Symmetry: C3
């Protein structure tokens, strides 16, 4: 049995995606999640939807409580967490409207807690050095890629996301630099979301939707405009991918993730 | 009508630059500015001078209240903000004593608020994603460049400033690395000063004075020594540039900046 | 007369290394050190041992009070500070088990105070811009290198340490990137430890022990396993190096360090 947590990004968090919906506000040892959890289903698969920036989008990337969001989904029983995020393209071949099933990231954030084990919560004691060689779940990414193919969607099978602190967009000099570092797309929320999901032993995958070419011309209006035009893609991908995940066995994948997380903790 | 805000850097904030001076201490929703605002004129142009590190230079780069400084200048009616800053040269052709009218930056700071919209001030509500493709005002930079030419000063027409957190200087390994990233000069205060000026809809330009070659030998004494020897250059440049700015029309430039800033804000 | 402060890293802080031991808990203007100071000797040389993460290793890298640790050693009279640290190798020639007498660093940390002069302690007033061209003491590194040679140990004479914030390990994309930046080894504690030692006018050197190849496969268990197998090397190196340091004259070296630190401070 699996339960899919879904974190929706800017203009990519439509509750209508789930049937038999029920709102549920929760609390965690790390504070309150961005907004209430929406419990529902996609076919016969249990899901939990959460708006990363709050349903009215009032939380900037730097201020999102990533710890609470991941902890709440974990506490709810989620075995998987698939998210959506807008991003700028740092590669000509990645055109706005394209989906990128990212497999790597480059951290450029500075003021964000990246671990549950901060030595101040009973629920998570000790020091945790979580491995990040493969930040995203390969099995989940695989089904997303195949499903995108079945839907005839322009989709890139891999990509490195550079996550900046924000809220400002990058300067042109930074944009060029990120390209030399091997970054393919850029956003403000992948890190530490992917890191905390790992510590929680959750299969995490990200559906990145290119909304602009950054500036190597990006603006809020341009991003919102592209998201509005392409939101249906991520929705369709999730609706078709989730039932597939629910039809396969994950016991082993989840076991290996649990072990990796457990053995990354150093106790007193 | 224009009003020029001038933020003076280390040993580059001489109040004598303005005539008909008047001291004015102010407060802002983000706290107190580094020091009192000095109101005065350069020819027929109204100006507002502010010492970035306080008149006695007691504030380290990491601790400068960039938000309050920019907000105070904005509240005072400034349409432009031209600043001075010492910096290390990362390029052989940029010799100590040379002026660099920077046009780009690379952020390496880590503990600095970079937006007025931090969701805790009525004066600035919502989330702001300010564009940084062109961080500095091209029209202002243009007049600075031409004026430097008329003054016969060694001046570089462009350059990328890498702003480090400090207060320590860079290691040699970092110095070499910055060069590979395309950085031309290095300092500790350009970011987030330039970013906040943008959010405020202000035309911002920076007069960077190379004071050393970093270490790709830099020391406090070396920087102070070079600044003392070349301070007159920035003063003369400002005195000659400002009247020129006041003689041209900026209504359109300021309108486009206001629009960019306004449309970068996402309301609830 | 010299006094060697020794900061022991993960599984590299054996108090048995000193004879005539005496435990001593202290306080500093910056708070409490990671654990009690252990006073003792190695031959005829006075030493002070301190466990970076606490004797039970309960402090994550981001939370170590580097200021208090360095200040306590300084207050105790230490002229030198030699430390041990595990690290990942970013170079094929640097094999796990190898020692690296690092000479440079690249900062990737984000939430760490890096100066004693934060404008809130009487003991350190003003603004300090400490030079970092040569972060590590060349004379101390020289004796460590020669001693390693006399012990027949695989030892690299130089290397650039990239210090990440942690507590998570790097992603593969970050690992590759660090290699392009010229980094040779990677850890989570060199910065700001080396910076604060410099401000304190202390000769600082680091004995880096490669424990893995990062991921360009690293895990907590792998690191602990390698450290357990090679801990004896760092211990032997320290035991043999320290008496040599005590047999030479450092008055001039220490004088130049004191001057550099003193002249890096800007008073009101
Ligand atoms: N070129 C770009 N650079 C950085 N972030 C973004 C984004 C993402 O969309 C939002 C900003 O418009 C924010 O959540 C960020 O993660 N779209 N395009 C971007
Ligand atoms: N090589 C260098 N690296 C970093 N900052 C500076 C500076 C600037 O001058 C001051 C330090 O001396 C500080 O305000 C910083 O922005 N001059 N030379 C520098
Ligand atoms: N590949 C690697 N990356 C980052 N840090 C480390 C370390 C160091 O060892 C500890 C983590 O296992 C921590 O103190 C860190 O500084 N070993 N291997 C590492």
């Amino acid at each position: 049995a699996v339960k899919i947590g879904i974190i929706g990004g800017t203009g990519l968090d439509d509750p209508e995606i789930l049937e038999g919906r029920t709102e549920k506000y929760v609390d965690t040892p790390f504070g309150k999640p961005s907004d209430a959890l929406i419990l529902g289903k996609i076919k016969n698969v249990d899901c939990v939807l959460l708006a990363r920036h709050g349903r009215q989008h009032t939380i900037m990337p730097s201020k999102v409580n990533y710890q609470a969001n991941i902890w709440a989904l974990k506490e709810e029983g989620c075995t998987h967490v698939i998210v959506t995020t807008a991003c700028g393209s740092l590669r000509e071949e990645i055109q706005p409207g394209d989906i990128v099933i990212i497999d790597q990231f480059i951290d450029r954030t500075t003021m964000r807690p990246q671990s549950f084990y901060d030595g101040s919560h009973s629920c998570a004691r000790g020091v945790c050095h979580i491995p990040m060689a493969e930040p995203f779940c390969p099995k989940t990414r695989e089904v997303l890629i195949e499903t995108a193919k079945k839907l005839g969607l322009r989709c890139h099978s891999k990509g490195t996301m550079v996550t900046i602190e924000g809220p400002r967009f990058s300067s042109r000099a930074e944009s060029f630099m990120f390209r030399t570092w091997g970054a393919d797309v850029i956003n403000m929320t992948t890190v530490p979301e992917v890191v905390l999901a790992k510590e929680a032993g959750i299969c995490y995958a990200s559906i990145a939707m290119a909304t602009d070419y950054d500036c190597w011309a990006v603006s809020v209006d341009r991003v919102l405009k592209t998201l509005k035009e392409n939101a249906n893609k991520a929705k369709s991908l999730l609706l078709t991918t989730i039932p597939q995940i629910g039809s396969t066995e994950w016991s082993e994948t989840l076991h290996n993730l649990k072990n990796m997380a457990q053995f990354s903790v150093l106790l007193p």
